[PDB]
Every structure is written in structure tokens, then in C-alpha cells.
Design a protein around this ligand. Structure first.
Ligand SMILES: [Zn+2]
Ligand SMILES: [Zn+2]
Ligand SMILES: [Zn+2]
Length: 74
């Protein structure tokens, strides 16, 4: 499926993922796309904070869903 990731700079990233791809897998893809370390990434979907070890389907994230990227710089 295809999902979108909106960032703090206003950009919209398009990613190709499988239903069971983990949040950590998605962060790795975002790191390649935007050059933002995966360990500093925090994703949100429908007001839910997404956990690294869970999958997209675990959060009912479907085709064309929009996720938000926020950061943790410590
Ligand atoms: Zn596969
Ligand atoms: Zn994958
Ligand atoms: Zn939103």
C-alpha cells in the first residue's frame, strides 16, 4: 500500500509499504527519504502515537492514510 508522511517543514512523503510493515521499518524509510535519524522520529496517526514494534495494520493504517512525523531531539 501507499501511505503519506507529513513533516514539520510542510513536506509530504509518499511511501510504499506492506500492511504488516512495522513502524520501525517505516522510520527507516523516512530516514532514507529525509535524512532524519530513525531514533529521533516519532509518528502519529489519527491521534495515536505509533510504537516501533507494532505494524501499520495494528493501527488500521490503510492505503492513502496520512501519518505525521514529529521529532525527539532529547
Ligand atoms: Zn514482504
Ligand atoms: Zn517492509
Ligand atoms: Zn492529521
Amino acid at each position: 500500500m501507499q501511505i503519506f508522511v507529513k513533516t514539520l517543514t510542510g513536506k509530504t512523503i509518499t511511501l510504499e509499504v506492506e500492511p504488516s510493515d512495522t513502524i520501525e521499518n517505516v522510520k527507516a524509510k523516512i530516514q532514507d527519504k529525509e535524512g532524519i535519524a530513525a531514533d529521533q522520529q516519532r509518528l502519529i496517526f489519527a491521534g495515536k502515537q505509533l510504537e516501533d514494534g507494532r505494524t501499520l495494520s495494528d493501527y488500521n493504517i490503510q492505503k492513502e492514510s496520512t501519518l505525521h512525523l514529529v521529532l525527539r531531539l532529547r
